[PDB]
Amino acid sequence: GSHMKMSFRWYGKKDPVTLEEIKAIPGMQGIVTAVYDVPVGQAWPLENILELKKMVEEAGLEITVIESIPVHEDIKQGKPNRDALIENYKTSIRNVGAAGIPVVCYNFMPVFDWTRSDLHHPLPDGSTSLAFLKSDLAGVDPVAIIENYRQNISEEDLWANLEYFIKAILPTAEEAGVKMAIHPDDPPYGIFGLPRIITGQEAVERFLNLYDSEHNGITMCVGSYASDPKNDVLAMTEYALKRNRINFMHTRNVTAGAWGFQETAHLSQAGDIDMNAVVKLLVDYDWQGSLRPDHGRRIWGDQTKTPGYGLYDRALGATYFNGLYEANMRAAGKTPDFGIKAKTVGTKE
């Protein structure tokens, strides 16, 4: 039966936003984080991981998702030395299972993790936000790897590069008891001459099939998939739930059509995603995992640099999912839990 742990992203010691503050978000249970002192491709030690955990748990919370044991471009590129990098991935996996963290979250997106044309695009209310202006700048080389991809490696070269990968790590993932969750490409389509393959329903279906197991699931990031209208998140989310292969939810809204795309407040009505439908769906399928609001607007004096990762609107995101998850739970004769063990401290009757 259902079990959704409201979660927040936290970059660790050097985060603008603190655990004190994250904890104050009504219903917050999971911290979604990573090790940041180990170079990409290089293998996370247990101590790095337990350091983060000790901090997070003292704050009165738990790490429920490692967001991103990063994939070395060499691996993505399909270069001969991959196995070396892959064996390191296997260690990091083994190490996270060792810390008791249920899920690992990763992308297979070549040289770029995300693309945004404007980082302060105005919205109909004064708040800024990020957008992808299909017009602006677009159609210019970003000023060796890129040319490699552009020239040689096809999408199906990437499909085989990727299957090699997940075929290498999955048994390790299984023994650690860690659920992999592949993060869609963002935007979910070819740019810059680079290829993207994790982009829609057909790909989620081919990907899961790469290695048929729950240890091999997706991170349903509705705002990424829906950054291309060619995509319908609802049937995608459902297909994926019907199949038991969502291991992580992100839940940011986005407005889109043929013109490009722009991130908006989480509220279904502010963008093109019916967020109620999304969580109603998480409800009826007794989904068990974690959800993060993910990405916000710049509202108020918001001084967090690091892009959509300011506290305020992301917090205003979780409490909206609080209302959505709770109302839908009740509607179905289901009793919602938010992990509150005490209303008060020291008073009581």
Report, as residue numbers or ranges, the catalytic residues: 183, 221, 250, 294-295, 309
Separation of alpha carbons 156 and 175, rounded Å:
29
Compute the least distance from the CB of residue 314 to Mn ion, in Å.
Answer: 11
Interface pattern 262-301 for Mn ion (x via CB under 5 A) = --------------------------------x-------
Contact of 296 with 314, CB cutoff 8 Å: yes
Scan residues 239-298 and list those touching a copy of itself (CB under 8 A): 255, 257-260, 262, 264-272, 275-277, 279-280, 297
Torsion of CA 284, 285, 291, 294, to 10 degrees: -80
Q: Please, which residue, 197 or 222, has the CB nearer to a copy of itself? A: 222
Q: Tell me the C-alpha to C-alpha distance, in Å, between residue 324 and each of 8, 22, 23, 148, 230.
A: 17, 20, 20, 46, 26
Compute the least distance from the CB of residue 89 to a copy of itself, in Å.
Answer: 36
Both structure tokens of 321: 């999912």
* From candidates 13, 37, 60, 175, binder to a copy of itself by CB under 8 A: 60
Collect all residues with Cβ–Cβ distance below 8 Å to 175 and sequence separation of at least 6.
94, 97
Compute the least distance from the CB of residue 169 to a copy of itself, in Å.
Answer: 37
Scan residues 122-161 and list those touching a copy of itself (CB under 8 A): 122-127, 131, 133
Residue 250 contacts which entry, Mn ion, a copy of itself, none (Cβ below 5-8 A, type-dependent) = Mn ion
* From candidates 215, 250, 266, 280, binder to Mn ion by CB under 5 A: 250
Compute the least distance from the CB of residue 323 to a copy of itself, in Å.
Answer: 2
Scan residues 305-344 and list those touching a copy of itself (CB under 8 A): 311-313, 315-317, 319-328, 330-331, 336-338, 340-344
Q: Please, which residue, 176 or 279, has the CB nearer to a copy of itself? A: 279
Under the criterion CB under 8 A, does residue 119 sit at the interface with a copy of itself? Answer: no
* From candidates 12, 15, 16, 23, binder to a copy of itself by CB under 8 A: 23
- Contact residues toward a copy of itself (CB under 8 A) are 20-21, 23-27, 60, 122-127, 131, 133, 255, 257-260, 262, 264-272, 275-277, 279-280, 297, 299-300, 311-313, 315-317, 319-328, 330-331, 336-338, 340-345, 347-349
- Contact residues toward Mn ion (CB under 5 A) are 221, 250, 294
